[PDB]
């Protein structure tokens, strides 16, 4: 008997049902209460200024035409009937190429209750557009939005809500971090209005707050560039008669900074300005450049070719431009690290 | 009413032929267009294209969809666009494009009571524009978007920008990473092909490349390596192991700049303005090491048969000629 009643309920719901028109097209607005469960805040692409997110995207609204009376109170539907029932045209305002999964069946469920309330969830993969301000790279933090709303229906036709308190609506899974470069600090849920050429739409908004971990860039970029500058200052404690040695020591630290400037440059999208790591490399390239101009000034005032033999004619003296540069250049690089790591670990 | 609205719409699409143009034997239909650009995603110099996300909207008057009694603009489902006549407009620059289909296919049909119809589309197109990169990276680029009717000629369909010059919006909100939009323009004209004369609309930008990226990476170390090649002029000629190890390591550093920028800059195989500066700086590094062997051959090879004069001469000429080379370079490409 139950297999006969259930098929006759699903036949009489679609009699006279026009899915082309909104529930209450001239009567009232359609309050669509939305709800998001984030299962993986996927990998954020810095060079594309985008990120990926896997959601169970829930929707709930009331349709008067789908009331029924039967044995059960809630129905479950195959998606052939979910394509015959009206569905709000939610799109993502910053989506780039998002995927509605259908393995192995289309991952959608539509549930009718006896009073007409529809529950419509889907499993999505949304590739959204996150604008980034990389002036403080890598010691920066930016909020990636996930903004959605109706496509054709204005504020006078379809209004979106949340199914509960807005901070409790967007839920992130505890094991669903799935980030390796950033650190998901928490989300913020809000709601807004666009002024399009067609009309005013209701926009739900979720911002995900990300702070970049800088432990990779210290070992790969900062510490070899610090230790190369420490090298090019250590040639000051060599004797002034080491004319091949302090030349060989000087230019090879420049080629080492040239090697480190290339590999640090590849791990960055091509912004139009100086990132915070680029302020560090260009100044560290200047301490290595100026350490060889120091030896070009010492060599101009040497006046001899031989050095101090260990058993003792007249000899050279340790120059004033060497004894000053032993004090000046480690200090001006030490003062620069105090200015750099306090300006950018404050912002 | 709500049940009356179904009976109104069902008799609009009863007997409606989607194969026929509106006024199929009469006047040409006038389609007015409207683009709300969401974002210009990336501008690639290798593939010679740019990605464009936009809200592409079209308005035309259809007498077969005139409904009376209902004082509201019927905004229907997106699936009724498969049961109407929509224009067959395309893009000539279009390499690859798609209408967004999450959560549904992002279309709209907003009927009006006089017969006016809006058909919006959120399209992410990859439009192709060729670039004159002979002034890279000090260049301006003009990338277009051509909009044309495919089958219908200018006797069947007619295009116009709806709103005049305020048709395309959202260009001032675009903040490209390494470019800067100077001015966008709107062009309406008719183009004759081998089949007929078709109407064409053109949206076209003017991209100016920002230069702060390439000074820190490409120009400034290539300058400071040439200056370190001049250090072998204030060193005595007897320092053979010192004056060689400057200029030999200096031609190696210019090699590792040029070869690793070839792997870092976009690969476009012809001669650019950055290639002539890096080859131009490589010569001053190459000539400064020729200066020592010209000194080393005179004192020792043609010695037992002036030496300080050539080192004194090169301290003035090579900083002057390289500053003269920058004056030729930074005035020709600016």
């Amino acid at each position, epitope marked *: 008997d139950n297999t006969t009643v259930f098929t006759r309920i699903l036949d009489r719901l679609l009699d006279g049902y026009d899915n082309r028109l909104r529930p209450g097209l001239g009567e009232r607005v359609t309050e669509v209460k939305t709800d998001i469960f984030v299962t993986s805040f996927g990998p954020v692409s810095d060079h594309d200024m985008e990120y990926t997110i896997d959601v169970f995207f829930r929707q709930s609204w009331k349709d008067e035409r789908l009331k029924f009376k039967g044995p059960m109170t809630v129905l479950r539907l195959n998606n052939l009937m979910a394509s015959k029932i009206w569905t709000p045209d939610t799109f993502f305002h910053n989506g780039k190429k998002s995927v509605a999964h259908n393995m192995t069946m289309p991952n959608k469920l539509l549930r009718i209750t006896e009073d007409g309330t529809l529950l419509y969830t889907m499993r999505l993969t949304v590739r959204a557009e996150c604008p980034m*301000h990389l002036e403080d790279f890598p010691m920066d933090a930016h*909020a990636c939005p996930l903004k959605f709303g109706s496509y054709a229906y204005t504020r006078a036709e379809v209004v979106y809500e949340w199914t509960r308190e807005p901070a409790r609506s967007v839920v992130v899974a505890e094991d669903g971090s799935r980030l390796n470069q950033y650190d998901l600090l928490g989300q913020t849920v*809000d709601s*807004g209005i*666009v002024q399009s050429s067609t009309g005013e739409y209701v926009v739900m908004t979720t911002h995900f*707050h990300l702070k970049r971990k800088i432990g990779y860039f210290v070992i790969q970029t900062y510490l070899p560039c610090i230790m190369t500058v420490i090298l090019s200052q250590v040639s000051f404690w060599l004797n002034r008669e080491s004319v091949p040695a302090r030349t060989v020591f000087g230019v090879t630290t420049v080629l080492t900074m040239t090697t480190l400037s290339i590999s640090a440059r590849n791990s960055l999208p091509k912004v139009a300005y100086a990132t915070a790591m680029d302020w560090f490399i260009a100044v560290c390239y200047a301490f290595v450049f100026s350490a060889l101009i120091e030896f070009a000034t010492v060599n101009y005032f040497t006046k001899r070719g031989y050095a101090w033999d260990g058993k003792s004619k007249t000899f050279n003296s340790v120059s004033k431009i060497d004894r000053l540069s032993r004090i000046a250049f480690p200090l001006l690089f030490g003062i620069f690290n105090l200015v750099y790591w306090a300006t950018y670990l404050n912002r | 009413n709500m049940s009356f609205v179904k009976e109104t719409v069902d008799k609009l699409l009863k007997g409606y032929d989607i194969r026929l143009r509106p006024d199929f034997g009469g006047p040409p239909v006038c389609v007015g267009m409207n683009i709300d650009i969401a974002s210009i995603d990336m501008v690639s110099e290798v593939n010679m294209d740019y990605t464009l996300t936009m809200y592409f909207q079209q308005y035309w008057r259809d007498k077969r969809l005139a409904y009376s009694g209902i004082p509201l603009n019927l905004t229907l489902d997106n699936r009724v666009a498969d049961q109407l006549w929509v224009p067959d407009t395309y893009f000539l620059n279009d390499k690859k494009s798609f209408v967004h289909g999450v959560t549904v296919k992002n279309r709209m049909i907003r009927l009006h009571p006089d017969g006016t119809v809006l058909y919006g589309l959120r399209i992410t197109t990859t439009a192709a524009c060729m670039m004159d990169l002979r002034r890279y990276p000090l260049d301006e680029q003009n990338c277009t978007l051509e909009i044309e009717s495919y089958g219908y000629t200018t006797d069947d369909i007619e295009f116009y920008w709806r709103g005049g010059d305020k048709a395309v919006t959202g260009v001032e909100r675009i903040e490209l990473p390494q470019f800067s939009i100077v001015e966008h323009r709107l062009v309406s004209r008719n183009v004759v092909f081998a089949t007929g004369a078709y109407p064409r609309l053109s949206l076209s930008f003017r991209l100016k490349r920002n230069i702060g990226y390439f000074i820190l990476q490409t120009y400034m170390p290539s300058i400071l390596i040439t200056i370190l090649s001049w250090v072998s002029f204030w060193i005595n000629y007897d320092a053979s192991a010192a004056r060689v190890a400057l200029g030999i390591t200096t031609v190696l550093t210019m090699t590792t700049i040029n070869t690793h920028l070839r792997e870092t800059l976009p690969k476009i195989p012809y001669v650019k303005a950055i290639d002539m500066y890096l080859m131009g700086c490589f010569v001053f590094v190459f000539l400064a090491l020729l200066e020592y062997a010209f000194v080393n051959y005179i004192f020792f090879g043609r010695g037992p048969q002036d030496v300080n004069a050539i080192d004194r001469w090169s301290r003035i000429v090579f900083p002057f000629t390289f500053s003269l080379f920058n004056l030729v370079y930074w005035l020709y490409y600016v």
Partner: nanobody
Amino acid sequence: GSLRVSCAASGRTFTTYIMAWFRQAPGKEREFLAAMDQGRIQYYGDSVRGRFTISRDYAKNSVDLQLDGLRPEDTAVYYCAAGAGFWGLRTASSYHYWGQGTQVTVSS
């Protein structure tokens, strides 16, 4: 009566940034009023929703605020904020650029 408080920026293109409007009565409480994002998305505080109208101009690098339906409770100093909202869009600690102040006085 209506009013239109504007905010002309300088020195930096704030198209990417969120340009907001705050409010501080005597009592030291920075209150959110409105904020428009880069994609022309109008956020509003629930006390001034439906009354104030924010409207950025992106070619001139400015943010406006169409004050309408004013009351003597709206008599305060209106700060023009700008910056990317990190833990933001309702919080003053996310806005790193600030306006001077505009004493809007309403007397019934």
